[PDB]
Nucleic acid binder design. Sequence first.
DNA 1: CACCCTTTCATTATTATTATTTTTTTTTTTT
Lengths: 102, 219, 328, 241
Amino acid sequence: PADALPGEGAVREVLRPLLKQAAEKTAAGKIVFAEAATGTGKGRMIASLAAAAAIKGDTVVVSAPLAVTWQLVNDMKDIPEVRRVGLTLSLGRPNFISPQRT
Amino acid sequence: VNLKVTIDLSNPMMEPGDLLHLDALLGALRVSRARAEHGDAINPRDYHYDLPLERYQAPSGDWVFKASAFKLKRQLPNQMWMQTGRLSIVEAARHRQSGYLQLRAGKPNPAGGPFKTSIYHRPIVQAELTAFCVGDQQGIEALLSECRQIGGKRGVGFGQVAGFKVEPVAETDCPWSWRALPADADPRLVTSEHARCIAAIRGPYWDRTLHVEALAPTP
Amino acid sequence: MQIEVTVRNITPIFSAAPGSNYITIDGTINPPPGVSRFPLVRTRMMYVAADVGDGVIKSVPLQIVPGNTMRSLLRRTMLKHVIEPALVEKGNKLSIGAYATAYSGNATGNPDGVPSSFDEIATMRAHPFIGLFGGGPRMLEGRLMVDSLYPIHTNAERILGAGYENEMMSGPITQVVWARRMDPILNLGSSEDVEVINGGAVAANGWIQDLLANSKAAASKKKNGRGLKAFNAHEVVIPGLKWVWRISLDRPTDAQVGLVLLALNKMTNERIAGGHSKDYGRFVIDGVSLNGEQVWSQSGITGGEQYFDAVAEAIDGLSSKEFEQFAQ
Amino acid sequence: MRYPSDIVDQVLKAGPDKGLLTWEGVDAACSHCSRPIQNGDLYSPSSVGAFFSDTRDLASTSRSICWRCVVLRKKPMLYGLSAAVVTQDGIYSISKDVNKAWLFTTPPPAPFLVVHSSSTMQHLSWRTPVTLDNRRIHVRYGPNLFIVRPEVVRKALSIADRVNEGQKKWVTPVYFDRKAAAMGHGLITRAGAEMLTQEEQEFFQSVTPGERWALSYLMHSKRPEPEVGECITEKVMTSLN
DNA sequence: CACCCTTTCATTATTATTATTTTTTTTTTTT
Ligand SMILES: [Zn+2]
């Protein structure tokens, strides 16, 4: 894996091709339709795309359901590039509770 | 490399009189590429042989390109297109009065001349086009990337390429021999559907001055 | 470079098709023999490939305008709107064979095959008008590829491509409009309406007995002249339909694209039909996209000012000797 | 045998017109024939008025007519050759359907030139290549160049006659237009789609438009049989002289 | 000779023609 993306080594070998053209055509400014099956580890490939865009200076936003959130930040903790640029989460009013009522 | 090329169409195309040869398509594509990469004032005779294909030499001269003709698999029934040509007589009359037109004749002629109305009908086929050739796949892809039309470069909208695909195949599968060949070709290369005629075997297949005594297949 | 013009037709679209087409009075197209039929000239339709339905390809009808009508319409609006006022503000007088080469795609400048050097091929393909189409005895390839007017329709989804799924039509798009001609002598009321006729009552009566004798003789032959009383049919494409128009230029100059843009600026007064008496083919332009970027506005074309300056200095400098040298 | 202009000497006997120029300079092809006009060969400059519609089918652009197709460009050679086969022995009119049964299906001669007029009169004999072998017939019809094979047409006739066997009324398996101008030229008929199989439909659909144009004149309600032609060679010779 | 009119000739012959048949769910975690 010479000249690999950040976090590429934890992505499976089958998803490496989708990841490379997805990063390439998002580097060109196009909206990329990338399709993979359930057990092929799309979270790791998404992490690679987010890290490789984050080292360019880009403000990267990852939109996902709240069940996918924990494994997405699980794929976003140990790579050094998102450790350098930081990772945060935006949560709404239904993520919290009223203290007085509870 | 002994590869094989399909083109599928987003628009119906003119059914070719005689054979659509793949090397003719690549020659026209290389002419367009040379027009982009030099400019407009060039000789198309110079660059339409600069092709990434093999060149078969018959036993006593008469060399041809190693590229078989386009075999046609009809997705659609072979319909017909009509086109007409006529100069608008009304604008000619108003330009004749306005002085912008200098026409001594006071009457047109729809059977002949500048104001001739002409009707003509050409076959139309929507098809998968499969050819067989020996050459480099990368150069054929680089040529066919510009190939927006095939069969007719009509400028009027026909033969628009939905896509193309080149794959290598084994030797015994590929019928390269299905091509216009010289009469001195090898006995293993002459088939039953080949017959002796006047045909071009190379380059501009429309140029009747280059047409030779050839053994060629029937579309 | 590509120009995609999305237009809506204000009036119906009619481009007549060849063949002998017959419709009944109810609407059945091409009846079996032994029943009363009707003359019908359908609008032009091609059988195109369809991936709708199943993954296999099926042949479906698609009702279009042919691309030749598009090419001649674009050509004629450039001549009528920018080329002719420029050439008559200078005093230029074209010749037949140069007018025939500019206005039609014909080789009557010299019917002979005129040889074309590569330098003169280059200097005529870079002309703001001439290099778009070419034509004449040179028979050189024009730079303008004008496509058919395709309606945004589900039968054309292979032709249209992805992205037109929003604002898309389906189902039938042809309506068989029935037209007729009445013998207007039968419409004549009284002496005040008939006094303009030489003969008047005598001439009107004579035509009525002539038409009566011809009709009864034709009906007796059924169990070669023809009267004025006609009633026929023609399929038109429905008005208000959205259409895409693809104009792809093979290595264009700035002035050529500017000429196409100034054609689109003034083509609202043009028509696209075989219905010029009935005002068929009136359209307004809703979108013009150059290289994927939309440029049309409500007050004409806003954008491409380099093309506009190029075409202004191109149409200013032409003196029609280049048209004559293009012909012969 | 090599060129269409070889019919001017091998089949009929004709000479160059008086006043034609000999060829000078480097050798160039004819504007019409495609024959290379060598030095020592007679030629004409192109002085046509603006009624010659056939600019699209000019072989070259040397602005020169070879004398043999100066002869082919005169009017009796135009209308008298409106539908004919020009073999090495004579000129046979093929306007009868029986004659096209004779030539398209099992023709005796190998080398000839087959011309048929779509319109009333067109420049036809010089722009068509010579049929060299019978297995690949080159036909001109109007502005269209056409290819016919005898064996495939014989196979088509055998298929259509066996599927039409047992029916008193002749049913057309696949429609072909005689003018080749209707859109439905080459279309399989409904009943003919039933009484042909799918491989037979693909075979009748895959043929070149020359065989479709031949089977228009050969597959219809009454069926032609192959009989030889009336020789119009003396007829067009009397027209020419 | 470039610009047109208007004359002239030609042999066989037939005609078929694509168009469609849902289910009625209650998810999700925004302001
Ligand atoms: Zn010749």
